[PDB]
Amino acid sequence: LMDVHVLFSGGKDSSLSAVILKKLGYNPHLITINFGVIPSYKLAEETAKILGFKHKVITLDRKIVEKAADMIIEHKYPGPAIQYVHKTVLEILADEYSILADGTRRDDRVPKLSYSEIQSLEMRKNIQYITPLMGFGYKTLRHLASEFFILEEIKSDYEAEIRHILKERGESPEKYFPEKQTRVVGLKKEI
Amino acid sequence: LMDVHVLFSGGKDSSLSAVILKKLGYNPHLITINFGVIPSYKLAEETAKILGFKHKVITLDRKIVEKAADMIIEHKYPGPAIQYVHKTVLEILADEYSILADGTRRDDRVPKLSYSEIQSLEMRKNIQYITPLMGFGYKTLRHLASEFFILEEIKSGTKLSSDYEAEIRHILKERGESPEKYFPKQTRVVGLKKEI
Numbered sequence: 385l386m387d388v389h390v391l392f393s394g395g396k397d398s399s400l401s402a403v404i405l406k407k408l409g410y411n412p413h414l415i416t417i418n419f420g421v422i423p424s425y426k427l428a429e430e431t432a433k434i435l436g437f438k439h440k441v442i443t444l445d446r447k448i449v450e451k452a453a454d455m456i457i458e459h460k461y462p463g464p465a466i467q468y469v470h471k472t473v474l475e476i477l478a479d480e481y482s483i484l485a486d487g488t489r490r491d492d493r494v495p496k497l498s499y500s501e502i503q504s505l506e507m508r509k510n511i512q513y514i515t516p517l518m519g520f521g522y523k524t525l526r527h528l529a530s531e532f533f534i535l536e537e538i539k540s541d542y543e544a545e546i547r548h549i550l551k552e553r554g555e556s557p558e559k560y561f562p563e564k565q566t567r568v569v570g571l572k573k574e575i
Numbered sequence: 576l577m578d579v580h581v582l583f584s585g586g587k588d589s590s591l592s593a594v595i596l597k598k599l600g601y602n603p604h605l606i607t608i609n610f611g612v613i614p615s616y617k618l619a620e621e622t623a624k625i626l627g628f629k630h631k632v633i634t635l636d637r638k639i640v641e642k643a644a645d646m647i648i649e650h651k652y653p654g655p656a657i658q659y660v661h662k663t664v665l666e667i668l669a670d671e672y673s674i675l676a677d678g679t680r681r682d683d684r685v686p687k688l689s690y691s692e693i694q695s696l697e698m699r700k701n702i703q704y705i706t707p708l709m710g711f712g713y714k715t716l717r718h719l720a721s722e723f724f725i726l727e728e729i730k731s732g733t734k735l736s737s738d739y740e741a742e743i744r745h746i747l748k749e750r751g752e753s754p755e756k757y758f759p760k761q762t763r764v765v766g767l768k769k770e771i
Contacts, residue, residue: 409719499681518706
């Protein structure tokens with residue numbers, strides 16, 4: 385199979401992105417980003433074991449999420465900060481990997497590269513950026529998750545570490561982020 | 576098992592959309608629009624047989640293409656005309672099938688629904704619209720096509736492709752226009768490189 389490096393969170397739809405890539409004949413190499421602040425990659429690592437997929441944690445420069453924290457404090461809205469982290473991350477991985485994918489969904493607002501942005505990336509660094517969920521609305525994703533996974537209400541992306549930095553600074557993260565996590569617990573079908 | 580109705584032209588991309596839907600557990604019902612001008616759907620038919628998918632042709636009012644013809648005559652490039660037809664097809668089909676799919680893709684500007692057009696379409700018609708290829712770019716699709724399909728080139732003006740083009744092209748001819756001016760290759764899915 386052809387190799388694809390997938391930004392992976394361990395959630396419902398993140399796991400869906402990895403499963404789709406498998407069925408189309410890719411060998412999905414799951415990667416989760418950590419900036420050496422707190423080990424928030426655990427959930428993703430676990431669910432990758434469950435998914436039956438190779439997982440790796442790549443550590444990046446904390447400075448990236450420090451700046452993100454700044455942007456949160458600067459804008460209140462997290463969009464800009466998150467756009468910054470995600471983009472920078474892709475630019476980084478694109479210097480190592482030729483085929484990249486993540487779980488950006490149709491209904492998502494951020495992270496989300498624009499058209500020119502995607503083109504630029506693929507052209508400048510000679511890679512393929514793949515977003516399998518791009519064509520899939522909320523209802524469809526919901527249907528597909530419930531066909532593929534056994535799911536569960538529990539109560540691994542950049543948010544945990546960023547929020548952590550905020551706490552350290554004296555800022556309440558709750559102010560900058562909303563309230564809602566579901567866990568993939570097993571397969572109903574086989575990938 | 577969940578049905579889905581897939582606008583289908585018979586090209587390798589369109590075929591990839593079918594195949595993907597099937598990978599995800601859907602029962603794909605390939606459909607090709609016809610406007611009663613000419614039987615340009617023949618290609619899509621043969622291809623569905625080869626893919627092993629159920630196929631149907633849906634006949635729509637010829638005025639839809641008559642207007643696409645008018646629009647071509649004045650825009651001279653087909654974009655606006657293609658948009659108008661495909662949008663019109665979706666509205667009509669959305670009254671009959673609650674899960675609609677097509678072969679729209681990341682690197683084709685046209686045809687393509689905007690996000691706001693999509694949200695409107697789904698809410699007004701209480702429907703699911705699915706675009707498997709939207710997240711895949713030119714190069715990725717080129718690679719996927721060659722992995723799933725045996726392929727061959729169709730030389731310019733022999734076989735008729737099964738999208739709106741041919742039927743539009745035809746009206747333009749009748750009209751005393753020159754089609755080579757606006758619609759001056761073709762790649763045939765000849766077989767499968769592996770089970771779907």
